[PDB]
Amino acid sequence: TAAAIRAELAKMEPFFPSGLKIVYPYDTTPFVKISIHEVVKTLVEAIILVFLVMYLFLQNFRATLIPTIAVPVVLLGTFAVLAAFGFSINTLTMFGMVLAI
Amino acid sequence: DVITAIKAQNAQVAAGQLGGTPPVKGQQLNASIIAQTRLTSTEEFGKILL
Amino acid sequence: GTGVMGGMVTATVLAIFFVPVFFVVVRRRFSRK
Amino acid sequence: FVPMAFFGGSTGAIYRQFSITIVSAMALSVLVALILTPALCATMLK
Amino acid sequence: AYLFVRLPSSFLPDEDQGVFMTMVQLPAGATQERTQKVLNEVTHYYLTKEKNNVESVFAVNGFGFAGRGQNTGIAFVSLKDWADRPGEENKVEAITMRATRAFSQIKDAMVFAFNLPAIVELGTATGFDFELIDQAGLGHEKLTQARNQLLAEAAKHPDMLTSVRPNGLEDTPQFKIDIDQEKAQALGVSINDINTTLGAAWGGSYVNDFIDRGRVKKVYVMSEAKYRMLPDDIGDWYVRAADGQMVPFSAFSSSRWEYGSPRLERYNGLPSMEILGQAAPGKSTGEAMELMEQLASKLPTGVGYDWTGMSYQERLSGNQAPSLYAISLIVVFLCLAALYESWSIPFSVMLVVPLGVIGALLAATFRGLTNDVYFQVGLLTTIGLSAKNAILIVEFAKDLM
Amino acid sequence: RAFSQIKDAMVFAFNLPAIVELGTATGFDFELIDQAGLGHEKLTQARNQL
Amino acid sequence: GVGYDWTGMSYQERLSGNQAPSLYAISLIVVFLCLAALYESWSIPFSVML
Amino acid sequence: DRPIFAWVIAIIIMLAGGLAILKLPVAQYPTIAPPAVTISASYPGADAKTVQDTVTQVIEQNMNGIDNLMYMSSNSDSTGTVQITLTFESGTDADIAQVQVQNKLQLAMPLLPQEVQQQGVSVEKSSSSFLMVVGVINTDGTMTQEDISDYVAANMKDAISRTSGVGDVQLFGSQYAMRIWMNPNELNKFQLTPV
Amino acid sequence: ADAKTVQDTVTQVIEQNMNGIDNLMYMSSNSDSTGTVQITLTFESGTDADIAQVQVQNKLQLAMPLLPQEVQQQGVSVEKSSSSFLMVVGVINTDGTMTQ
């Protein structure tokens, strides 16, 4: 919704005369693109941390290049089953993804 | 005459407020003005002047 | 995060050698029948 | 997990805010890590 | 078992949102001028003694929540990024706290500044919302008194404790013109001419629409402020008679004061009032709302009650947490038989489950955390996780057997 | 050719595009909007200029 | 004070262009896909596909 | 089992999942709210007790046969405004709960005075929480509250609400009207009334 | 009514009141000299034509008493569009000709 509220306001930009500065005293859009940013920060921590705690215990590049290759497929395989029958496709699900991680 | 006198006395009108929307900078009080009200009983309908 | 790791620090250590772990195919399989 | 779909009203699909993905990432972890994994164990190992 | 039940349960943790808002409320009018001064002391505090936090203040005079008016007023606060405020002294956990302390500490206005509960509304945590309904068809004053009786009696119970306050209460003195119909009809003025001269000259009037440089806009007539500020400005309004006489109000009017409520509420087509309360520094809803029920039952006749945007409806943890694991426990030892045969394995786990739990409540007490809808999914994750710790040594022993 | 070849009226005769409308092939449809709130004549002239 | 838009021909976002390359894009990913299922490594994936 | 079939199923559930992340950009919530449909009427310059009876009660007395529904609350104000919020079950079609409300208002429409009837009445979906507030401020040759509040509506408020899924735009101000400020002394002098 | 009158007293009233219609792409006008106007609200290809029908009406019901009592009683109509006929059944005369 908010991606197109700006898009509608973007075309009014040039037909303004003197002293019409559009500000953002209240906004909930940058908080959301941070909830996505923190679930990219997390996961990458997990991918690296798993990649390491496999070199500890069962050391070898060619032994860790398997349980770490298997992990993205199940993650993006998750936001894929979100569409069908009558379920979702949102966030608090990208959040709920970090426990599924 | 009866009908016209009914809506002329059983009326719920809309009068404004003391110290309204655009004020004289220095106003201290604000109060909504009540003009006429809707008659509540059979007796008040009896006293409607024709 | 607390819900997992707090509920994990037990589950890991306290549920590998202690009580109802190996008290499972032993203490509550038979010991009776 | 999934029987959490028999939830309430305003705290409604918040327990469907998963148990489903935790089943998805679980059933995907039981299917993708079933079909694959053994697959990428025979190829290059040792 | 004695780890929670001791715990207050988190509904959903109220976050700092990078952005919060304040509120302003004034007594019995109390005009736009009287309020702007108060909104100036607020749109000053943020910009003067909180430069390193406040990005911008958006002061709006004549807004508030529950309704518009020359009495309310709010301001939206933008915050400087997130990394620009490190410590707890730096963000909306304490910013609102020393703000509430700095505002309401002094000055003749009700000011708060609250938090966005990370959602639209209904369901704080331990809070309630009571509705007091006129049932037998009493009066407004024969209801506000039952509201008074249940707010002065509920106020003599801080022994079990509750924090109760009403909404947009007031009941401001109103001015009542009394048009003498017999004096007006004999004097020679139309009753319809009087009400328009009082309506259009005091509250304004919508006449028609006009075109302004392309688009169509309204035409209002209200009269200059100078002649509508006070009760004495009523007298010098002259209405044309049938003869052609400029007859003023006075000679058929009766200037009387008297009270009246500016904000009337109704619940389901019945005169009703809130009332918006709490719980107690101890008990929560289940008792805090329950004792309130018969407190209203010991009130005058024709007074009933309902609960709205907090009375759920039927949800939360309670009445959703036991039936949660009920149809979970039936399935939890189910497939602990599929390849595990009889009731020999169904207790290998199923009772491993409270190994996971023990540390979860410990780390949500020795930390200060609370039972929420993620830790109550952590109570779901770890229990499933235990099916690779425990039941994945049972199908190593049963596989060895 | 037979219609518009002679006579003081604009006449065409076209084809049904095998659908309801929008999407001929290579064609466009331009809209010229009054934005700053000018006049009709201070728009028809921009229509004339374009 | 003169702006512009396009209506019943400005698509919206369709045609062949911007729909023909992303057509065979998610086609080409699937076109050599099952050219491996029973055909092993990247030896058959170019037997067709070209 | 052979692996190349599997390392192809893993190629799917990846571009079939990368196709579902193409719901860019992704919303924050979960529609957790029991859906609310609001009816907002405004009697200009009217008191609280008047709008309570002549406007508010008329609408409530006419709310019969609305599908589903939980409850309804009122806000008959002194400013001469009232809004009735009809709350429905969490999961009801907010598009059908929209039109049931309107088609009971259309039964009480000519019972509302011709002063309030032309003033508006509006039935829309609710949130009571803003997604964005775009402040239009001045930097030079300062126009003024009344001047900007007009232009914010005369040039770009119309472009919003009709756009991508806006419930109701509550603009901060007012667009121009032909304001006529009468003088009772100058009215009485020529034997004239507001009428 | 003339073109410039219906433009302001009828057409602009409806457009000023089109707020909160779900989905939607754009809206065009046709304030004519014949004293007629039709606003065509176009939606996304696949939207429910039954729900896009009623959103439009329930914003017209907000601008209904702002239209003059001359045009108000004359009609106003909200329906689905095609601008292309499926059939035209001409009723002609063969004997004792009645007239247009």
From Swiss-Prot, chain E:
Induction pattern: Positively regulated by MarA, Rob and SoxS transcriptional regulators (at protein level).
Q: Which residues lie on this side of the membrane: Cytoplasmic?
A: 337-346
Span-the-membrane segments of this chain are 320-336, 347-366, 373-391
Subcellular location per UniProt equals: Cell inner membrane
Q: Give residue ranges on the Periplasmic side.
A: 4-319, 367-372
Q: What happens when the gene is disrupted?
A: Loss of susceptibility to contact-dependent growth inhibition (CDI); inhibiting cells still contact the target.
- What does it do? AcrA-AcrB-AcrZ-TolC is a drug efflux protein complex with broad substrate specificity that uses the proton motive force to export substrates.
User: Belongs to which family?
Assistant: Belongs to the resistance-nodulation-cell division (RND) (TC 2.A.6) family.
Quaternary context: Homotrimer, with large domains that extend into the periplasm, interacts with AcrA and TolC. AcrA may be required to stably link this protein and TolC. Interacts with AcrZ. Part of the AcrA-AcrB-AcrZ-TolC efflux pump.
**What is the protein name stated in its UniProt record?**
Multidrug efflux pump subunit AcrB
Curated annotation (Swiss-Prot), chain I:
Q: Where in the cell is it found?
A: Cell inner membrane
The stretch of residues making up the signal peptide is none
Induction note: Positively regulated by MarA, Rob and SoxS transcriptional regulators (at protein level).
- What happens without the gene? Loss of susceptibility to contact-dependent growth inhibition (CDI); inhibiting cells still contact the target.
What does the annotation say about its assembly with partners? Homotrimer, with large domains that extend into the periplasm, interacts with AcrA and TolC. AcrA may be required to stably link this protein and TolC. Interacts with AcrZ. Part of the AcrA-AcrB-AcrZ-TolC efflux pump.
Role noted for this protein: AcrA-AcrB-AcrZ-TolC is a drug efflux protein complex with broad substrate specificity that uses the proton motive force to export substrates. (Microbial infection) Involved in contact-dependent growth inhibition (CDI), acts downstream of BamA, the receptor for CDI. Its role in CDI is independent of the AcrA-AcrB-TolC efflux pump complex.
Q: Which family does it belong to?
A: Belongs to the resistance-nodulation-cell division (RND) (TC 2.A.6) family.
Q: What is this protein called?
A: Multidrug efflux pump subunit AcrB
Q: Which organism is it from?
A: Escherichia coli (strain K12)
**Residue numbers of the full-length protein present here:** 52 to 151 of 1049
